């Protein structure tokens, strides 16, 4: 029979590679024809610096970083290890960017 | 088409592997999404009116910076 | 005969002393000023180079990156206290796993 | 053609800073575009936090002293101490200079 | 009447806030447009929270506004709340708010 | 003897806008120093940020537009367009008497 | 022949609806001023204090730790639960960003 | 006698319930001083230094609006 990991030690593996590095972890393309898509509504025919959609993407990941590592320790609260809406949710409204 | 999937389930996994995470739910992904959105929409809001107030067409890696100044969320190493 | 080296610090005095006349600050300001912001700018400056800089040393390198920056800075309490809301580009985190997420028994 | 517009920058006095901490230690472009915004966030700070003290002491001159108390404002407390500390002999250095 | 704030129509002081923004360290030069403006922004910011508070005071039968009825029409107006997100507005108290999973059955 | 100062304020304004939108009803001085508060934290909101604005542009002058810019940036959505409304109002209205 | 007692709960509940119709103060002034005045000495001794200046620091006192209550009753129903604890206290003043 | 004790249990309980509180452990009340403790040393360490800096022996509700306001905390009906 062949081998297989016990499912949890990879997402153990794949937590302490990304922790190590530095790289952004989006898509590069895709994030930057969401943002386009967001801003035409703000204002048609914008045009974009290519540091400027790197610094939002550089910010953009970093907040969704910190809000995992909040909405987990919600979760790890709950006597749980699975991250769920409501640990986002609370995170949010502990946060106020929710209420 | 319309962009906001392309922030894949893997991707949004990896993050969250970044930030401590073992284990997802999987309405998650879409909720996630949600609020990247919500939080782009503001952070572009700002930046695009610095850009209409120098009277631009284009965005520029300041309006940016400015704009996270704002949201409180102070951005290094991108200009000022 | 210049203003910096007549502090005994390596950053401007005189830019400092101009761009607190030109932010719209004050009316006036004093020629003290200038002097003592620059020094604690110097140090501030000093203080993150260093661990920065024993950091890259840690990386076995030589030149210090945003990484090594990052650690420095999360790594020390009160600097880390400092830029409390300050997101570092390319620094990444801590490697920092919770420990209800270990294995049993190690 | 053309030569590009001046963007100043501390990075010259913050190599010099470092060669003196790490003289064999270099620095990468994006860490000194850190540390650039690094003081520039630092200055709008302390000159922010002495703009407001003048003002309400209504006084028109933000002096040295209006610096160290908004250095003790806003710096954690070994990080103000030695700030306190190189800023006051900043002053009584280029004072008994002339 | 003479004075600029009669010349906008507005209640708000022109010619204070123009002043102020002098004195008050923002820019080396200021516009004769920007105190107006401004002047009348602060003016319907007050108007709607003393429409708002003004009818709180109208809920518990009082022609007085006290720090209760600014902290309710303010909490309670989404937008206004938004606003006042980090305000501690003293003698206000809170809402009256109960969570679900604390009540009887 | 007659000390205090002459300390200034917004509240006899809060008190012609009162009895605008609310002729028979009034104001406790409590409420009062939370209305004056009110107002100079937006007024020191709106104009730290057109400060901001005139700065970034490298334009000394804080006009109209500086303000209607910062507005926008401060105030919600629907709060925001009425701001706006007004303000460009007030304008119209004092450009036409002189 | 009863003696109509109170279940555990009834006047916590009543205790609640009461205090959010209310606004006064809820700590006892004097307390809160002496210890204004020993917290003060630590950095500067022989300090004045504005009764207005111990007003303004009480209520900003009194509407943080209302506040962190209810912020620290949304980390106790998150757990189940129902009686607040010191973990959902220091859970709240983290997600807030107070401590490390 | 340190004055933090006069805190009483409650005083502590009559804010809880302002914040919608039920039931309470009886170990809070240790950590709320601590909390409340800690919530007062920063402000009244800025409020002093305002005053320390205006020269003065007598600290204002100014010296404790400006702290609070550099606290993330702004406090209305003071002297905003
Ligand atoms: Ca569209
Ligand atoms: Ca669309
Ligand atoms: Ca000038």
């Given amino acids: ?99 | 088409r319309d962009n906001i999937q392309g922030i894949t389930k893997p991707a949004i996994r990896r993050l969250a592997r970044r930030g401590g995470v073992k284990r997802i739910s999987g309405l998650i992904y879409e909720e996630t999404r949600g609020v990247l959105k919500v939080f782009l929409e503001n952070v572009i809001r700002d930046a695009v009116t610095y850009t209409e107030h120098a009277k631009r067409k284009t965005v520029t890696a300041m309006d940016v910076v400015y704009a996270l100044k704002r949201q409180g969320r102070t951005l290094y190493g991108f200009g000022g | 005969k210049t203003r910096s080296s007549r502090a005994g610090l390596q950053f401007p005095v005189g830019r400092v002393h101009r761009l607190l006349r030109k932010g719209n600050y004050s009316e006036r300001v004093g020629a003290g000023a200038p002097v003592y912001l620059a020094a604690v700018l110097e140090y501030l400056t000093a203080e993150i180079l260093e661990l920065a800089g024993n950091a890259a040393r840690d990386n076995k390198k030589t030149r210090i990156i945003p990484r090594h920056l990052q650690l420095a800075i999360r790594n020390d309490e009160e600097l880390n206290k400092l830029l409390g809301r300050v997101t570092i580009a390319q620094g990444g985190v801590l490697p920092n796993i919770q420990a209800v997420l270990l294995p049993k028994k190690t | 053609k053309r030569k590009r517009s001046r963007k100043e920058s501390y990075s010259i006095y913050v190599y010099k800073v470092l060669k003196q901490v790490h003289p064999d230690t270099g620095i990468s472009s994006k860490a000194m575009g850190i540390m650039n915004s690094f003081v520039n966030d630092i200055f709008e700070r302390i000159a922010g936090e002495a703009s407001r003290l003048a003002h309400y002491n209504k006084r028109s001159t933000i002096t040295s002293r209006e610096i160290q108390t908004a250095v003790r404002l806003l710096l954690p407390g070994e990080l103000a101490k030695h700030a306190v500390s190189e800023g006051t002999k900043a002053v009584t250095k280029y004072t008994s200079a002339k």
Avoid: W
Wanted: glycine content about 4%; aromatic content about 8%.
């Fill in chain 1, 1 to 99: 029979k062949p081998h297989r990991y016990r499912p949890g030690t990879v997402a153990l593996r794949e937590i302490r590679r990304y922790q190590k590095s530095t790289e952004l972890l989006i898509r590069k393309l895709p994030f930057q024809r969401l943002v386009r898509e967001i801003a035409q509504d703000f204002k048609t025919d914008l045009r974009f610096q290519s540091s400027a959609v790197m610094a939002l993407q550089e910010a953009c990941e970093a907040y969704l970083v910190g809000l995992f590592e909040d909405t987990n320790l919600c979760a790890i609260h709950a006597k749980r290890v699975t991250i769920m809406p409501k640990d986002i949710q609370l995170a949010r409204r502990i946060r106020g960017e929710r209420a």
